[PDB]
mmCIF file of C-alpha atoms in Angstrom:
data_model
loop_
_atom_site.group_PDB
_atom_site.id
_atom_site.type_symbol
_atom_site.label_atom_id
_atom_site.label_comp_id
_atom_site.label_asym_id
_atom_site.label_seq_id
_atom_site.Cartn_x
_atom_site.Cartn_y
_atom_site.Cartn_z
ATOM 1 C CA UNK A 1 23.725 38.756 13.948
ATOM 2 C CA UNK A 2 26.121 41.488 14.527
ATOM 3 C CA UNK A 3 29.450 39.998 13.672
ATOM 4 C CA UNK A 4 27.159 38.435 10.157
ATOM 5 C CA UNK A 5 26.328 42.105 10.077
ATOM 6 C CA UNK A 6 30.499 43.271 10.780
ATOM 7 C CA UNK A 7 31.017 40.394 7.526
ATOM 8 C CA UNK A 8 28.374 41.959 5.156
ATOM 9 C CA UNK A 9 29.896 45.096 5.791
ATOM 10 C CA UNK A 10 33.444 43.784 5.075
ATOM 11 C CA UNK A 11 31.787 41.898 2.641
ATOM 12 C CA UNK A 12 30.632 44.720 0.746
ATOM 13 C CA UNK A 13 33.706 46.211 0.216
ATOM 14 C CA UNK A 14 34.439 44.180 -2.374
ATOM 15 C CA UNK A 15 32.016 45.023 -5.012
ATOM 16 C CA UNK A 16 33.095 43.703 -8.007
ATOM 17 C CA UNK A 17 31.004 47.383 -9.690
ATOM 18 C CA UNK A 18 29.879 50.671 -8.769
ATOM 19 C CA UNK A 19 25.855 49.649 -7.958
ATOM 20 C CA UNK A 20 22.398 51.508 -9.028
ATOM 21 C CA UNK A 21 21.892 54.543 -7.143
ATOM 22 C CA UNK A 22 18.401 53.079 -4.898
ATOM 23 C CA UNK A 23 21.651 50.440 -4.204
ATOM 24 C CA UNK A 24 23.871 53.078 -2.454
ATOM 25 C CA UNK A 25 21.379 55.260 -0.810
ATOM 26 C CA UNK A 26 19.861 51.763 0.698
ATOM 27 C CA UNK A 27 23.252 50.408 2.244
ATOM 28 C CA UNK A 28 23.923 53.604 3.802
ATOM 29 C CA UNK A 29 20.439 54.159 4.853
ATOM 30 C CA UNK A 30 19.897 50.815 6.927
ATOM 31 C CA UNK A 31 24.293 50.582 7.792
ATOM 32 C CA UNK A 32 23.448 54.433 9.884
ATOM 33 C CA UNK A 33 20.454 52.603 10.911
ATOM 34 C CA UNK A 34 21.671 49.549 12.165
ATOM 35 C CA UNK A 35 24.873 51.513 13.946
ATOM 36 C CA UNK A 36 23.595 54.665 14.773
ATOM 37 C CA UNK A 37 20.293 54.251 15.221
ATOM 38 C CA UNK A 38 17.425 56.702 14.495
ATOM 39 C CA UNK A 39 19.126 59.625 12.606
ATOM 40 C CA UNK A 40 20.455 62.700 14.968
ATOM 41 C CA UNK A 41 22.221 64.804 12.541
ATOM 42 C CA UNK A 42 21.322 68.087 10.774
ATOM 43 C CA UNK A 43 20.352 67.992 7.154
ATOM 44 C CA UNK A 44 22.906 69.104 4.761
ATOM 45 C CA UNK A 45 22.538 72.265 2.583
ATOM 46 C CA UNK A 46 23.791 74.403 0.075
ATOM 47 C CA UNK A 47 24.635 71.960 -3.371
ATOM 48 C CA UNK A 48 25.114 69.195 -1.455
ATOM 49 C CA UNK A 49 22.718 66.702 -3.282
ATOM 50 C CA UNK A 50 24.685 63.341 -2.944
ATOM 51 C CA UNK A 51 24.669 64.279 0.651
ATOM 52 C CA UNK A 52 21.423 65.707 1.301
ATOM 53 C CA UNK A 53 20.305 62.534 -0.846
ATOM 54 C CA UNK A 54 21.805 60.377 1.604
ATOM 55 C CA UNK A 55 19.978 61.939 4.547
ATOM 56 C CA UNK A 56 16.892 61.821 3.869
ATOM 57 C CA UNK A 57 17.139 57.710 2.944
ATOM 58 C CA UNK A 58 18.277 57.512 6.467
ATOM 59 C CA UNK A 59 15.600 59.763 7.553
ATOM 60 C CA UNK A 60 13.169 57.595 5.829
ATOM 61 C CA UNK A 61 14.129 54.995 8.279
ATOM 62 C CA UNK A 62 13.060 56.524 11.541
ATOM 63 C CA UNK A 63 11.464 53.943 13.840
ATOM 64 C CA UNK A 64 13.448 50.691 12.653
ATOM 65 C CA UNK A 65 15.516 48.413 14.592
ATOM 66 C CA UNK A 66 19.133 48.045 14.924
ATOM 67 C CA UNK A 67 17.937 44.439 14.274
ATOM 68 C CA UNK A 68 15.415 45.095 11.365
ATOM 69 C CA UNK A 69 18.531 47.206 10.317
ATOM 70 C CA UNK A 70 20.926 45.061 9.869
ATOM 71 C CA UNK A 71 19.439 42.113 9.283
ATOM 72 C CA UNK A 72 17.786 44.120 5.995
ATOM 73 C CA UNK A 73 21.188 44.913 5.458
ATOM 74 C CA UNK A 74 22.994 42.280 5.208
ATOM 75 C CA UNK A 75 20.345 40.437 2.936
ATOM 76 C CA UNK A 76 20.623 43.233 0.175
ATOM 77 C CA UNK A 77 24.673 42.573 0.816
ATOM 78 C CA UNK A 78 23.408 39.405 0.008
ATOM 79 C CA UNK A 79 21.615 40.386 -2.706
ATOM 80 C CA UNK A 80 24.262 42.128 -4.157
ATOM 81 C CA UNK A 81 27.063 39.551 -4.024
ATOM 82 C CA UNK A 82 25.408 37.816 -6.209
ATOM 83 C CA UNK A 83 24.289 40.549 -8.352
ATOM 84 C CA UNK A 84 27.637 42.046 -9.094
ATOM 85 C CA UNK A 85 29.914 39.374 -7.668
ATOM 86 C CA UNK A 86 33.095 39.323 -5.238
#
């Protein structure tokens, strides 16, 4: 599923529109997931909201699987190419 996963990714990129918030925060948060794995990183601070923001979505997927992950992933992609368009 990987390289599907490398194609959604690629894929992506070429969002015809800027998406919904939830949207964002969700690709990110399962992409880290799928690649990473279970976050290891320090939360942000300060007025850093859009980052911060972005942390905890990862954080609130501890436990998944690279496969869950991606797979996830790449359907919302999915989802989204239709949605918006390429």
């Amino acid at each position: 599923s990987q390289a599907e996963f490398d194609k959604a990714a690629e894929e992506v990129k070429n969002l015809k529109t800027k998406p919904a918030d939830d949207e964002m925060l969700f690709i990110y948060s399962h992409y880290k997931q799928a690649t990473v794995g279970d976050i290891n990183t320090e939360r942000p601070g300060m007025l850093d909201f859009k980052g911060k923001a972005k942390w905890d979505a990862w954080n609130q997927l501890k436990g998944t699987s690279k496969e869950d992950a991606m797979k996830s992933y790449i359907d919302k992609v999915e989802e989204l190419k239709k949605k918006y368009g390429i």
